Scaffold this active site. Structure first.
Site, mmCIF file in Angstrom:
data_model
loop_
_atom_site.group_PDB
_atom_site.id
_atom_site.type_symbol
_atom_site.label_atom_id
_atom_site.label_comp_id
_atom_site.label_asym_id
_atom_site.label_seq_id
_atom_site.Cartn_x
_atom_site.Cartn_y
_atom_site.Cartn_z
ATOM 1 N N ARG A 41 1.089 -1.167 -0.026
ATOM 2 C CA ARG A 41 -0.005 -0.024 0.107
ATOM 3 C C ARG A 41 0.965 1.308 -0.127
ATOM 4 O O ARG A 41 2.122 1.139 0.413
ATOM 5 C CB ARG A 41 -0.840 0.044 1.328
ATOM 6 C CG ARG A 41 -2.220 -0.739 1.226
ATOM 7 C CD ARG A 41 -3.245 -0.165 2.182
ATOM 8 N NE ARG A 41 -3.731 0.993 1.644
ATOM 9 C CZ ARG A 41 -4.138 2.086 2.078
ATOM 10 N NH1 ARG A 41 -4.668 1.952 3.492
ATOM 11 N NH2 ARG A 41 -4.557 3.436 1.327
ATOM 12 N N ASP A 66 -2.035 -0.076 8.987
ATOM 13 C CA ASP A 66 -1.001 0.909 8.918
ATOM 14 C C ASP A 66 -0.095 0.882 10.291
ATOM 15 O O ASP A 66 -0.178 0.027 11.010
ATOM 16 C CB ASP A 66 -1.950 2.060 9.352
ATOM 17 C CG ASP A 66 -3.352 2.507 8.366
ATOM 18 O OD1 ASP A 66 -3.005 2.404 7.248
ATOM 19 O OD2 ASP A 66 -4.191 3.259 8.503
ATOM 20 N N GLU A 233 -3.778 14.315 4.974
ATOM 21 C CA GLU A 233 -2.690 14.379 3.946
ATOM 22 C C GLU A 233 -2.769 15.397 2.985
ATOM 23 O O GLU A 233 -3.982 15.596 2.550
ATOM 24 C CB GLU A 233 -2.693 13.073 3.225
ATOM 25 C CG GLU A 233 -2.352 11.823 3.812
ATOM 26 C CD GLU A 233 -2.953 10.617 3.414
ATOM 27 O OE1 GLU A 233 -3.976 10.597 2.985
ATOM 28 O OE2 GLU A 233 -2.560 9.412 3.847
ATOM 29 N N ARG A 249 -6.609 16.537 1.664
ATOM 30 C CA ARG A 249 -7.554 15.793 2.030
ATOM 31 C C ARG A 249 -8.366 16.256 3.202
ATOM 32 O O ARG A 249 -7.721 16.992 4.006
ATOM 33 C CB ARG A 249 -7.064 14.367 2.541
ATOM 34 C CG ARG A 249 -7.950 13.247 3.280
ATOM 35 C CD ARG A 249 -7.034 12.059 3.397
ATOM 36 N NE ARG A 249 -7.683 11.214 4.524
ATOM 37 C CZ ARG A 249 -7.414 10.041 4.670
ATOM 38 N NH1 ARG A 249 -6.365 9.226 3.759
ATOM 39 N NH2 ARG A 249 -7.981 8.874 5.748
ATOM 40 N N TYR A 343 -5.375 5.034 -2.820
ATOM 41 C CA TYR A 343 -4.166 6.060 -2.981
ATOM 42 C C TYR A 343 -3.826 6.181 -4.495
ATOM 43 O O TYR A 343 -3.272 5.113 -4.657
ATOM 44 C CB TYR A 343 -3.140 6.110 -2.095
ATOM 45 C CG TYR A 343 -3.468 6.461 -0.545
ATOM 46 C CD1 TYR A 343 -4.784 6.404 0.045
ATOM 47 C CD2 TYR A 343 -2.505 6.574 0.267
ATOM 48 C CE1 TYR A 343 -5.044 6.740 1.255
ATOM 49 C CE2 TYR A 343 -2.678 6.933 1.576
ATOM 50 C CZ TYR A 343 -3.786 7.082 2.257
ATOM 51 O OH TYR A 343 -4.078 7.680 3.500
#
Ligand SMILES: CC(=O)N[C@H]1[C@H]([C@H](O)[C@H](O)CO)OC(C(=O)O)=C[C@@H]1O
Length: 380
Positions: A41, A66, A233, A249, A343
């Site tokens: 990712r 994450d 972000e 974002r 993303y």
């Protein structure tokens, strides 16, 4: 041992024989479960000073977790503008276990003035973005640390260091991460030469966007003043007169991107507003100059390219949007990848076409030849 990088200008978009935007062949750069129980990712894409095309992303062991999952930053290189790719290499490998360490969410920053490439990412121990606590001691397992990896040989080897203390001037800043994708070197105006990337932070005010920047070509980093509320972000881009723009974002889930402007090279930002034109599901995205070398007052200097998931709630329809006017309006939106994209990022390649990466069961790469641009933004 690889030779030292030499200074060279960033690439500009170039005209192809194409008349319409059409995605080239899709390259599977990393596929989830190749090998079993490994996930990929968080993409970053750049053209190195020698013209190599570099893709970076997380290797996430066990699941696509994450930070503080003990992730690694890895990379693949193309020396032919995306047609073929060398084997994956490690930028910085995490460590599993009771004293786990993770390196996650990469962004590249290429300095054309030196040839050096930076790769920013978190360094995690036991806490991720949401659970990190105040503190900057490099061994503090409760802090989400910020690392920068430097390469002086076009990305073949890396050296690492912790930048958390130098970018933390407000002791209430309890967490930070540099947004994955790519930062910029400034080429125009009073701060030409400055290297700058954006972070998301939480501090006594809220969840803010914050620039970090270097005026010594990446030896030392300083944080500008933070901006906004419910930020996340965000990416910075140098407009045609050297004003900077950040495109963010929105953590408040408006269904839109957010934008702000800096007249001082990222030290201060103005008010944050929604961009009504740019539908977004609260997801990462990348904005870039098409012609970063073009000078103030040229038509080329005003052209921006933006990639995101053009949808209000789901991370679908990877779309390239174009502005001809320094980001004031977005005159063209075109979906180059229908369905799940997660993303995305994009980077001008050495040959002047656009490279794109997106997330679908790992990281995927393709190319968009750019001959059609003049039909959307006249170039003369
Ligand atoms: C350092 C880190 O946590 N990065 C993660 C990021 C972040 O949690 C969020 O942007 C904060 O609101 O979110 C996502 C996401 O798919 O949404 C993946 C990134 O890995």
């Amino acid at each position: 041992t690889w030779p030292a990088a030499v200074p060279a200008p960033l690439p500009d978009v170039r005209a192809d024989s194409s008349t319409r935007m059409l995605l080239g062949p899709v390259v599977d750069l990393a596929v989830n479960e190749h090998p079993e129980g490994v996930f990929y990712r968080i993409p970053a894409l750049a053209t190195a000073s020698n013209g190599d095309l570099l893709a970076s992303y997380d290797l996430r062991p066990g699941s696509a977790g994450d930070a503080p999952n003990p992730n690694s930053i890895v990379q693949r290189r193309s020396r032919d503008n995306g047609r073929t790719w060398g084997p994956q290499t490690v930028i910085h490998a995490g460590t599993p276990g009771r004293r786990k360490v993770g390196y996650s969410d990469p962004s590249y920053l290429v300095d054309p003035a030196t040839g050096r490439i930076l790769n920013f990412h978190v360094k995690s121990y036991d806490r991720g973005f949401a659970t990190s606590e105040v503190g900057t001691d490099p061994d503090d397992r409760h802090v989400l640390h910020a690392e920068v990896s430097t390469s002086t040989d076009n990305g073949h080897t890396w050296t690492h260091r912790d930048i958390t203390r130098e970018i933390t001037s407000d002791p209430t800043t309890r967490t930070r991460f540099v947004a994955s994708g790519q930062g910029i070197a400034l080429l125009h105006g009073p701060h030409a030469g400055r290297l700058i990337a954006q972070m998301t932070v939480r501090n006594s005010v809220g969840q803010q966007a914050q620039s970090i920047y270097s005026d010594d070509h990446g030896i030392t980093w300083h944080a500008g003043n933070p901006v906004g509320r419910m930020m996340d972000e965000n990416k910075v881009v140098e407009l045609s007169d050297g004003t900077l723009m950040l495109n963010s974002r929105d953590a408040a889930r408006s269904g839109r991107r957010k934008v702000a402007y800096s007249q001082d090279g990222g030290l201060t930002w103005g008010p944050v507003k929604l961009v009504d034109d740019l539908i977004d599901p609260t997801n990462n995205a990348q904005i870039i100059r098409a012609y970063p070398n073009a000078r103030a007052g040229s038509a080329k200097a005003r052209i921006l390219l933006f990639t995101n998931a053009r949808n209000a709630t789901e991370r679908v329809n990877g779309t390239l949007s174009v502005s001809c006017d320094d980001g004031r309006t977005w005159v063209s939106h075109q979906t180059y990848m229908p369905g799940e994209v997660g993303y995305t990022t994009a980077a001008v390649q050495s040959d002047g076409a656009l490279g794109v990466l997106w997330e679908r069961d790992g990281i995927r790469y393709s190319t968009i030849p750019m001959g059609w641009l003049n039909s959307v933004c006249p170039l003369a």
